[PDB]
Paper text:
The Arctic mutation, encoding E693G in the amyloid precursor protein (APP) gene [E22G in amyloid-β (Aβ)], causes dominantly inherited Alzheimer’s disease. In summary, we report the structures of Aβ filaments from a case of AD with the Arctic mutation and from mouse knock-in line AppNL−G−F. These findings have implications for our understanding of AD pathophysiology. Comparison of local conformations in this region revealed the presence of additional hydrogen bonds between adjacent Aβ molecules in mutant protofilaments; these hydrogen bonds cannot form in wild-type protofilaments, providing a plausible explanation for the increased fibrillogenesis of E22G Aβ. Mutation E22G may have an additional fibrillation-promoting effect, which is the relief of electrostatic repulsion as a result of removal of the negatively charged carboxylic group of E22; in the wild-type structure, E22 is trapped in close proximity to the carboxylic group of D23.
Author numbering:
A (entry chain A), B (entry chain A), C (entry chain A), G (entry chain C), H (entry chain C), I (entry chain C): 12 to 40
D (entry chain B), E (entry chain B), F (entry chain B), J (entry chain D), K (entry chain D), L (entry chain D): 11 to 37
Amino acid sequence: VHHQKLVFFAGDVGSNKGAIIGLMVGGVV
Amino acid sequence: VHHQKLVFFAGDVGSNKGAIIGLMVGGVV
Amino acid sequence: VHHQKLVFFAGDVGSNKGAIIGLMVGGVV
Amino acid sequence: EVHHQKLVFFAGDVGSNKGAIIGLMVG
Amino acid sequence: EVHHQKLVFFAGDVGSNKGAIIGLMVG
Amino acid sequence: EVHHQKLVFFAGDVGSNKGAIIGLMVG
Amino acid sequence: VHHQKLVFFAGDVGSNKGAIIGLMVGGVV
Amino acid sequence: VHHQKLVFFAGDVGSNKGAIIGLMVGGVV
Amino acid sequence: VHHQKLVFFAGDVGSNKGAIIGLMVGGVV
Amino acid sequence: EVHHQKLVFFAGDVGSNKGAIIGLMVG
Amino acid sequence: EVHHQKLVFFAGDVGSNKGAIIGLMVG
Amino acid sequence: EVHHQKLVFFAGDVGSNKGAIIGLMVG
């Protein structure tokens, strides 16, 4: 089982007001 | 089982107010 | 089993207020 | 048993409240 | 048993409250 | 038993409160 | 010759995002 | 010749984001 | 010839983010 | 002669500008 | 002659500017 | 002749500027 670079941003990210999650298994975001 | 670069952004991302998730298995976003 | 670059953005992304998910198996978004 | 909820209420303006507004009421 | 909740209430303006606004009420 | 909550209330302005605003009320 | 209480609010006004004008003779609102 | 109480609020006003004008003769609001 | 109490607030005013003008003859608001 | 204007542009979000956005251009 | 203007631009968010944004440009 | 202006630009957030943003440009 190999998980790598599941979300990849090659450029810039200006503003995050939401959620950025690699792997989401449980909980509330 | 090989998961790589499931969401890939080659350019810029201005603003995120929502969700960006690689792999979504459970929970509430 | 090989999952790669399931959602690919070659240009820019201005604003996300919704969901961008690579692979969606369970949960509520 | 009540668990794992997200609630997003009132994205715009609310003029007047003369009653009750309650997020979570238990019992 | 009540657990794991997120509540986001009133993203804009509220003019007037003359009643009750309660986040979490237990018992 | 009530546990693990996040509450975000009133992101904008509130003009006037003449009633009650309570975060968490126990008993 | 006598203008009085042309707009009368006996109760409460929650929010105004528009125009409330007594007497409108010229201009742009 | 007599202008009085052209806009009358007997109760409370919660929030104003617009215009409240007694008498509007010229200009831009 | 007599202008009096053109806008009258008998109760409270919570917040103003707009304009409250008695008499508007020229200009930009 | 150009006078007495009010301009309210872009009440929501703008994702991306790659061109020109100009309030007032004279000459 | 250009006079008496009010300009209210961009009430929400702007993600990315890669071009030009100019309030007032004279000549 | 350019006179008597009010400019209110960018009430929310700006993520990224890679270009130009100029209030007033004369000549």
